[PDB]
Each structure stands twice: as structure tokens, then as C-alpha cells.
Design a protein around this nucleic acid. Structure first.
Ligand SMILES: [Zn+2]
Ligand SMILES: [Zn+2]
Lengths: 186, 100, 56, 92, 118, 56, 49, 144
RNA sequence: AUCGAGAGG
DNA sequence: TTCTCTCTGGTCATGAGCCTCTCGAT
DNA sequence: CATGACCAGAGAGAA
């Protein structure tokens, strides 16, 4: 409900299958570089390494997944408070932190919510995405089949008309606003 | 095949083994790093036979690899060959011993 | 005719039990790791071979 | 009254459908040779049953007689062609 | 392997060699915490892995209608109520062995005849 | 198909039509055969253009 | 998160079949991965059974 | 007797029921009905209101409930009258009804208005044919 | 004309 | 330090069976 | 759609 714009979040596991220094980074909608996952996490207020892994790994007896996560804990060891995590952001100083704070609830995981104060839900969900990424990377779950019909949707007459009607109704609304401005006095 | 050495499968299998590419990763099961600081007495009981038979004539950190019986059987590969190739890779920059 | 279709379906049955045997043997870890292919590959090859033989 | 249920492809991942209600009949030989061969289900924990297997077809192929006896591309061909057949498209 | 975190920071510990007494310790690097090591193993890297071949065993498994039922008896309790499945590992060179779960005593057994592990 | 249990590498489970066109395909055989025939049609539909461009 | 998902799933299915949950809403309990997914989406194809 | 299990023949009974209640284009009608009843209002209320400001005041215009008529036509030099399908086809007309919205204007510290015509899917709820009889249809030159 | 859609071997 | 050396992701970019029909909005 | 060369970068040998 609302503007049906689509954001695309990528969580990329860098490093080839036989390479070491295998890091995990995420793509966020308005920042040039991928930023490492632990820096996101700490920007969402989850500071300790253990809490982060607890958000990603839901079993402490999975030493494989935690071993895969070790290079990410090493990757963001430099950033160990929330505010400096928010600072690491590609813009053209305090406004940097504010831009990051905004992006985190505005364009990052917009479907969870776009209202502020629910950093926990988005942190847990990012961890869930990371978990299934690693599950695939450990040859535990298979690649996701993009041709399963259940993952497909059929836009019918209703939705098509609704998408068209939104666009033109806002054009009519903008026209109304322009006629209002033009008539400042009459 | 060499002209005239056709129809003897064993020569052919020797060429197969000589020619098919092999890495360490092909035969390795698991790779471990232990803290084993006194060379003459390991903390791994299994390895004692090994360190025992090193009675002829560094760094306390141990790198210990386990290798696959079946993979070692699919190639004609010896523990000696593997170890000699590792030792030849690293030029006494690393001390290697192995099981039998 | 009924004799010929009896033979045809008995042939299909014998292929089905051939593949049943192949599969139980695979499930007991009793396949041979013939060079160049996975165990699952050997199994798939044998089953498809059996069924094509049955059809022919 | 909860005798029938809507299932989408995602949800049918978690279910086990029978093909005909006869699959639920218990068993404990002498068969018609001319009938097709049905493997016994060898499954028991059914949760649903098909309304009728023939319901997998569209409007076009539902016109094809005995499509379970023809090579499938012919059924696709007839599906394309029946839309080119003439007839009373509307009484008005 | 196991992993350990500082009790105060909940940050992961880094190994250190007590060169004097040849000891293995684990240090935090947010604060000055340190502690004895409880195993000489620091790094384990499986290439042939079995971890996750039994993945997805919960007591609710016996109520998955999707899963098939064998006629075998449990080695432990000899109930013939069991669910079974192939290895949940999605490596493509994976043994086609079937793991069975007794629905009466939650005990996992196997059709394997070449090995008897765990 | 949701009419089969999991991990079922059977002949009939994975697309063996033991029936002839004369006797008639069962619903699962019908659908699997349709799956194969569709691959046939698409192979046709694009090989046509690929060979046209090759000849050109 | 939910512990005791068998009870909750039985309740949800009985509600949908009673009509108290919309019959077009879909509900999947993935037992072996400990997941429950409910979809109230628009535009997913379903069939009766 | 009454509780005995069904057989494969009995399946067709259920199938008949399924179609008696829905016909063969249920997807189209359900989609369009859902659009008209609920989605239309939502979009009218999305971000609708507008406010312009001056030195002293601010003026605001807010759209409210929508109303969708039954299909009609405005005849040039003529009245508006109920448009039925066959007439819309023969006369190259657009079978569409009108959108009227309750728009208010507040000021700091209008009635229904026309905004356009939405094409109606035949046999949807705003279509005249939805409640029509077989005899009604024949009288309307619409094939049953 | 232009853009598009359906179809035929 | 120079110079020649490899040497790879973001790009921009190509066509893509022949006809053949008919229709339908601008 | 989808397969792939050209720079442009920067790491990288020799005298
Ligand atoms: Zn600490
Ligand atoms: Zn048991």
C-alpha cells in the first residue's frame, strides 16, 4: 500500500569457493560501496560480536557457520560503536550520520516498516538473509529455484487498473494544485 | 597409446594417473590448526605413533591434515608422494612429517 | 495379442525390479566408485539404461 | 463446511494429494488386461484428494477427446487450432 | 571447534601464546579479559563434511505427510513406525543412504552397511 | 508432484510411462509426458531461428 | 517466533475452513526448517481440493 | 448410507457446483470487483489532500468517499442516460460509469464532484447484466 | 504511415 | 624509477528463419 | 535476452 516502488537489497558473499578472506557485504540503496554486514548491524544498534552472530546463527553448536562468519567480525572490528557505524557512509559530517539514520529506516528493508525505532526487526531479518546465504554456501540448502510458480504472481484486471489509476489520479491532483496556485486571488 | 602398447590396460591406467590433474584438496578430508608446542610429545593421542617413529637425528603451531582412504585409492597416490610434494613446495620453510 | 502384451508387461515388471535392486544397493552404500563419476551419476545412468532397455 | 479447500502452489509443498478417492480404499490379481496400468500409491498419509485429474487442463484441451492417448504436442496443436474452428460463437 | 566470547563484552576472543609457559590463552581485544584455553584446537576446515546430513530432525517430524514410511524396525526400540529421507546435504557427490527416524523413541538409524557412525 | 512422497527416485515417480498410447496414460504420466513435449516444442521454436541466422 | 506450532497450525486451519480466516489466504508449516509462512497476497494462483 | 464415502463419479457433482457458483471467468470479475469496492477508495485516499499557504492562511482540499455510478452516456445536445452494452457496441461508445468524490475544503484555524469515467467490466457488480435474467438478456440483445 | 497485437507453414 | 605487461569488470552492443496474412489505435 | 571485446584501471616483473 502506497507508492509501489521496489528496492533491491543484495547480500553478497565475497571470495571464491577455494579462496580465503571470504567476507560478506551488503548493498544499500543510496551508498556507492557495499558495506560489511557487521557495520550495518552496529548502525542498527547491535554492538557486540556475539549478539550479531546470535542474530545470524540460530544454533551455537554450528561451528561451521560461525567459522564462516569470523572474517566479517574481523572486517568490522575497526567500527565498534553505533555512531561511527552510521558515519561510515559515502556522501559528497553530522549530516552524514543523519543521512545514514534516515536511509536505514527509509530505503533499507522498506517492506518491514518505514517508521523509526524498529531497528531490531530489520537486524533480525538481515541476519535471516545472511543465514540462508551461508546455508547455501555450505552446500546445506540448494539454490533457490526462480521458476517455482508459488513465487510467481498474476497481475489481473484489478491491479492493472489500479496501477494506471494511481498514476493518472495523481496527475489530476497535480493539475488541481497548479490551478489552485494560479488562482492566488480569484 | 604408444604404438604397440595398446590393449594393455595397465599402461593405459598409468597414463591416466600420470595425466589427470590432482590437487591436495582432492584428497584432503579436514584441515586443522592445533596448539601443540612440545614437538616430541603431541597432545593428540593418535599421532603419538607418528611422533614416536621420528627418532632419527621451529614453531609451536601445528597444521594437521587428514586424508581420504578412497580418494587416495582412486589415484595411485602414496602418503610419501604427498608429503614429498609439500616439502618440495615449501623448501624447508616448513617441517613436514606424515602417517604411514 | 494378450500373450504378447503379457510378455510386454512382464518385461516392464522385470525392469522395475532391476531398478529397485539398483536403488537398494545404492542405499546400502554398496555401489562401486568407478572412476570419473559420482555415485549418484552411476545410479542415474544405470536406471535410465534399464528403463530404455525395457522400452526397446 | 470445511469439506474442500483452496491450495496455492506454495501451500501444496506441504501436502499429499490422492488422485481418486479409491486411493483411500484398503487392500488385502485378476485384472482387465486392456485397462491402463496404475502403480499402487504405496502412500497412506493423505491430506487431500484431487477433485478430478482431468481438471488439470485448460478450456481448449478440455475439448480434445481421449488426450490421454495422444502424443502431447498434438494436444498442443489441437489447442491452438480449435480456436480457429468455425461455429456459433454467440446466439445473438 | 568451539568458540568463546569475553564475559564482559560479548566480543569474540583471539588466541595468544604464553611463550614463557607454552600456554594457550584466549584474549579479548575490546578490554583486557583473558582466559585459559579448553581445547588445543583453534581452526577446523572440513572439505568432506557430514554436518547437516540429519538437519531437520524435530519431534514434529512424524507429522510431515510428505515424508515416506519404511517397514524397518528400530535398532533401539523395534517400533516399525519411522520416517525416512536421503541426506539433507546438497553436495552432488553425496551418499544415497537413507536415514530413518523412529517415531516412538526419536532415534535416528541408517541403511548404511559400509559404516556405523553416531 | 504433490501426489508422491519425498525422496522417491522410482521409475513412475520420475517420468516413466509404462503405458502405451493404446492403453492410455495416467494423470502423472500425462503431465510428465507433457513436460517432455513442451521441451520439444521450444527446441523446435528456437532452433528454427538459430539455423536461419546460421544459414544467413 | 512460536513454540508449539502444531497447536497454532491446527487452530489456523480450522479457522480458515470455518470461514473465520479468508479461504484464499494460504498457510504453510515447513516442519523440517521450523518455519511458518502465511500469505494474504493478491495475485497467487490456487485451486480447490 | 448418508455418511458413506464418495466415488469418482460423485466428483462431477462437486465440479458442477464449483461452476454453478463461479462460471468460467471468475478471475476477471473477482479482480475487478475487488478494485471497484476497495482499491479505488484506497487510491483516492492515498496522499490525496493538498495544502497551499499564504501570509496569514492555509487552504486545504481533501477527497473523501468515492461513488461509482451505473454505466451512462452524455449525448451531445442531450441528456445523460443509462448505457447498455449492445448500444455501446453498435454506437462505438465506451461502457463506463462515473466517479464522484466527496471533496471538502478546509481553511486555517462542496458536495459530490465529477472526476472522470471508469470503464466497467461486463458482468461485474456495476454492470447492468450482473443481476439480469435470461429473458432480461434476450430483451437486451445479449447472448445468455 | 507508424507503433503494436494475433495468427499461418 | 620506466616501460612494457598482463590482464579483468563495467560497459555498450549486436544481431536474432523466411515469407505470408489479417486486424487495430494513433 | 545474453554472450562478449575494449579500455583503464592497478598491481607487476625486469635493467
Ligand atoms: Zn572483553
Ligand atoms: Zn525407536
Amino acid at each position: 500500500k502506497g507508492s509501489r516502488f521496489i528496492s533491491t537489497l543484495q547480500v553478497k558473499l565475497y571470495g571464491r569457493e577455494g579462496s580465503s578472506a571470504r567476507t560478506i557485504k551488503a548493498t544499500l540503496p543510496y551508498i556507492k560501496q557495499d558495506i560489511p554486514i557487521v557495520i550495518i548491524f552496529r548502525a542498527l544498534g547491535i554492538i557486540p560480536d556475539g549478539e550479531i552472530l546470535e542474530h545470524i546463527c540460530y544454533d551455537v553448536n554450528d561451528w561451521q557457520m560461525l567459522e564462516m562468519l569470523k572474517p566479517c567480525v574481523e572486517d568490522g572490528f575497526v567500527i565498534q560503536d553505533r555512531e561511527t557505524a552510521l558515519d561510515f557512509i559515502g556522501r559528497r559530517k553530522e549530516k552524514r550520520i543523519q543521512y545514514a539514520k534516515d536511509i536505514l529506516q527509509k530505503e533499507f528493508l522498506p517492506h518491514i516498516t518505514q517508521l523509526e525505532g524498529f531497528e531490531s526487526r530489520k537486524a533480525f531479518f538481515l541476519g535471516y538473509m545472511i543465514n540462508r546465504l551461508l546455508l547455501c554456501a555450505l552446500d546445506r540448502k540448494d539454490q533457490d529455484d526462480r521458476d517455482h510458480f508459488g513465487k510467481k504472481r498474476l497481475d489481473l484486471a484489478g491491479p492493472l487498473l489500479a496501477q494506471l489509476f494511481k498514476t493518472l489520479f495523481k496527475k489530476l491532483t497535480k493539475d488541481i494544485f497548479r490551478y489552485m496556485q494560479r488562482t492566488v486571488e480569484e | 597409446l604408444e604404438p604397440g602398447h595398446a590393449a594393455d590396460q595397465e599402461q593405459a591406467k598409468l597414463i591416466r594417473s600420470a595425466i589427470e590433474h590432482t590437487t591436495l584438496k582432492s584428497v584432503t578430508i579436514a584441515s586443522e590448526i592445533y596448539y601443540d608446542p612440545d614437538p616430541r610429545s603431541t597432545v593428540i593421542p593418535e599421532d603419538e605413533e607418528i611422533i614416536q617413529l621420528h627418532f632419527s637425528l621451529q614453531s609451536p603451531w601445528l597444521l594437521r591434515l587428514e586424508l581420504d582412504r578412497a580418494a587416495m585409492n582412486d589415484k595411485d597416490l602414496t602418503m610419501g608422494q604427498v608429503g614429498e610434494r609439500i616439502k618440495q613446495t615449501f623448501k624447508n620453510d616448513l617441517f613436514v612429517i606424515w602417517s604411514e | 495379442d494378450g500373450p504378447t502384451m503379457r510378455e510386454i508387461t512382464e518385461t516392464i515388471a522385470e525392469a522395475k525390479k532391476k531398478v529397485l535392486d539398483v536403488t537398494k544397493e545404492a542405499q546400502a552404500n554398496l555401489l562401486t566408485a568407478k572412476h570419473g563419476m559420482t555415485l549418484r551419476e552411476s545410479f542415474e545412468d544405470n536406471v535410465v539404461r534399464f528403463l530404455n532397455e525395457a522400452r526397446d | 463446511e470445511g469439506l474442500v479447500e483452496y491450495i496455492d502452489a506454495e501451500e501444496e509443498e506441504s501436502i499429499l494429494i490422492a488422485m481418486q478417492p479409491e486411493d483411500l480404499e484398503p487392500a488385502e490379481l485378476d485384472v482387465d488386461p486392456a485397462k491402463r496400468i496404475r502403480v499402487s500409491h504405496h502412500a497412506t498419509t493423505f491430506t487431500h484428494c484431487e477433485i478430478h485429474p482431468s481438471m488439470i487442463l485448460g478450456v481448449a484441451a478440455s475439448i480434445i477427446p481421449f488426450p490421454d492417448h495422444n502424443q502431447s504436442p498434438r494436444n498442443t496443436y489441437q489447442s491452438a487450432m480449435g480456436k480457429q474452428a468455425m461455429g456459433v460463437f454467440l446466439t445473438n | 571447534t568451539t568458540f568463546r566470547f569475553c564475559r564482559d563484552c560479548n566480543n569474540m576472543l583471539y588466541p595468544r601464546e604464553d611463550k614463557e609457559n607454552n600456554r594457550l590463552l584466549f584474549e579479548c581485544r575490546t578490554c583486557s579479559y583473558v582466559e585459559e584455553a579448553g581445547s588445543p584446537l583453534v581452526y577446523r576446515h572440513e572439505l568432506i563434511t557430514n554436518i547437516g546430513e540429519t538437519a531437520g530432525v524435530v519431534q514434529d517430524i512424524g507429522s510431515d505427510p510428505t515424508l515416506p514410511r519404511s517397514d524397518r524396525e528400530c535398532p533401539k526400540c523395534h517400533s516399525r513406525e519411522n520416517v525416512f529421507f536421503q541426506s539433507q546435504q546438497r553436495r552432488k557427490d553425496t551418499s544415497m543412504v537413507l536415514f530413518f527416524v523412529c517415531l516412538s523413541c526419536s532415534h535416528i538409524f541408517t541403511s548404511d552397511q559400509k559404516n556405523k557412525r553416531t | 508432484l504433490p501426489h508422491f512422497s519425498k525422496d522417491d527416485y522410482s521409475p513412475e515417480s520420475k517420468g516413466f510411462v509404462e503405458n502405451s498410447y493404446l492403453r492410455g496414460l495416467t494423470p502423472q504420466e500425462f503431465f510428465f509426458h507433457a513436460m517432455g513435449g513442451r521441451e520439444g516444442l521450444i527446441d523446435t521454436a528456437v532452433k528454427t531461428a538459430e539455423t536461419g541466422y546460421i544459414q544467413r | 517466533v512460536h513454540r508449539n506450532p502444531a497447536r497454532l497450525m491446527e487452530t489456523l486451519r480450522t479457522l480458515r475452513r470455518k470461514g473465520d480466516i479468508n479461504p484464499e489466504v494460504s498457510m504453510i508449516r515447513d516442519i523440517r526448517e521450523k518455519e511458518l509462512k502465511i500469505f494474504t497476497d493478491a495475485g497467487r494462483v490456487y485451486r480447490p481440493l | 448410507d448418508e455418511s458413506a464415502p464418495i466415488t469418482a463419479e460423485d466428483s462431477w457433482a462437486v465440479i458442477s457446483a464449483f461452476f454453478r457458483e463461479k462460471g468460467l471467468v471468475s478471475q476477471q470479475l473477482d479482480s475487478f470487483n475487488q478494485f471497484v469496492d476497495y482499491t479505488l477508495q484506497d487510491i483516492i485516499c492515498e496522499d490525496s489532500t493538498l495544502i497551499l499557504e499564504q501570509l496569514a492562511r492555509k487552504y486545504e482540499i481533501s477527497f473523501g468517499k468515492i461513488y461509482v455510478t451505473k454505466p451512462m452516456v452524455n449525448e451531445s445536445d442531450g441528456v445523460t442516460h443509462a448505457l447498455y452494452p449492445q448500444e455501446a457496441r453498435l454506437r462505438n461508445l465506451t461502457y463506463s460509469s462515473g466517479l464522484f468524490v466527496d471533496v471538502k475544503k478546509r481553511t486555517y484555524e462542496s458536495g459530490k464532484v465529477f472526476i472522470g469515467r471508469l470503464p466497467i467490466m461486463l458482468r461485474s457488480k456495476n454492470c447492468y447484466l450482473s443481476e439480469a435474467t435470461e429473458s432480461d438478456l434476450y430483451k437486451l440483445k445479449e447472448c445468455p
